[PDB]
Amino acid sequence: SKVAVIGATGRVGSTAAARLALLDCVNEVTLIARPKSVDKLRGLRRDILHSLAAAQKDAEITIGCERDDYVDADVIVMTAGITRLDLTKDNAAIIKKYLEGVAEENPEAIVLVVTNPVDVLTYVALKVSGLPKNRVIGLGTHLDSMRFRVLIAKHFNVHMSEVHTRIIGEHGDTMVPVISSTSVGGIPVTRMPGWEDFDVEEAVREVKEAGQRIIETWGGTQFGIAQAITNLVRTILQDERRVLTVSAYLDGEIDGIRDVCIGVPARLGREGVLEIVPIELEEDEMRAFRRSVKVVKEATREAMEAI
Template sequence: MKVSVIGASGKVGSAAAFCLAEENALRELVLISREESLDKIKGEAMDMYDALAANDIHVDIKSTSNMEDVAGSDVIVLTAGIAREPGMSRMDLAIPNAKIVAEYARGVAEYAPESILLVVSNPVDVMTHVALKASGMDKNRVFGLGNHLDSLRLKTFIARHFNINVSEVRTRVIGEHGAHMVPLISSTSIGGILLKYFSNYKDFDIINMVEKVKSAGEEVITRKGATEYGPAYAISNIVTTILNNEKKILTVSAYLEGEIEGIEGVCLGVPVKVGENGIEEIIPIKMSKYEINAFIKAAEVVKNFTEEVFRAAEI
């Protein structure tokens, strides 16, 4: 299998590339950056080779600034864009990133139109829509990291609260990757038992837990300057699911055409079945009344913001 990572000179891009190489499922890994960062990704490749040798893993790693080198990729991970910084407004981030994402998406469509494009650049729901429109590719082959990382964060917080192994927790966050994310607490379970049936559920501060998930990324950025490991492994989860045709249900940012609550014309985090062809099915779900209303609100906010970004960035 061949995977290309666009924006590999950044912290998330380089960490994701290494996670993918460690999976030992790749024949070729292509690291792509702008010309001015080419020397840096060549250094990343050298460092990766040393680390992989310790585990007897061999992957051909190519460092390039030429988009033609994505040709033949099974999956392309798009992490390029300016980094999110503390205090940065959504529009400050969205406009320059929309232009960058659109440029690369057009390149993907030109040189690797049969690939699957996973968008990571933030704000991810909007950037997924930008990539989909700019590339002209099928909506099942262009989707974003969405709420997969948020779901993993909520899973971790719940496991720690109930002092239970994280593997026993089944939970999901949908909606916007941002302030309007929607945790599906009504269907969250531990060990196959709905959360609401646990005797100490009344001590579970849902509102506080949700706020912790919402602010988790910003807190990491404030403390250490950037998020790396969480996004990298979340990306690796999705890519290996595609490469191995695992047909897992993951929460990614997908373009909706009425599949859930009649929402259409916007990219939002929703549960989908992921396999070798990308999104094989958007999973219809039942939600509580509160969750439905929150999801509809998320759709409205993201759709309006997306239209604003499209106008400002002339996409």
């Protein structure tokens, strides 16, 4: 299995590439950046190789800058990225530059979009690549859900892995926390002693702002997004067939909603999205999801016009 990380010189891409190489299911990581960043990629390659020696693990680490260097990858991770609309237009052009026509040379490629705005760009990437709708996903609200898990786990003083929760919708201000799917040890939080003392609304506000707040303090998410990328790639390559909240193309599975890429619970395996789990949302949760799809659809239309 070959995984190509486009934007491997960035904070996100370098850290993702280093953690992906440690996966037993990843036999090659290809580091892709623009031609002028070649020396940075050479240093990163050496450093990743050194981490692999320390971990007594194996991976071939290659570098490149052209379509032929990564088109044949099993998974292509798009982390390259630079006014919200102007940013979307600039990053949509990057998507197109790298992913246009991939389906023709590698119809079996799986693309994971990380570049923001991730829901819009997942749709762009899907359309320009020509790949099947199930083979292009975005990170979406998976990391937002993990950030919500942290806050909940800390409140109940439980191991973070004991908390199961889901946030769906836009990777942004219209994200929808799904309390009806939130549990501590399988126990619905509404039945947990102390859930009354948890300020859900403040937590959601913290999650919505965590990205820019981390950007203004540390300089941007790095280890969290790298581990989330690693978790998704592993789920795919090992064909684990587990449900994760990712930005995926909708074709009528939820509330008849169609023609958009947005964060939803999807079972993922070696062939990509195996199914959009139809999620049993409470009335107010379904309403919020609808408001979120509307925003993402309008933004998606603008980006498609631009390209």
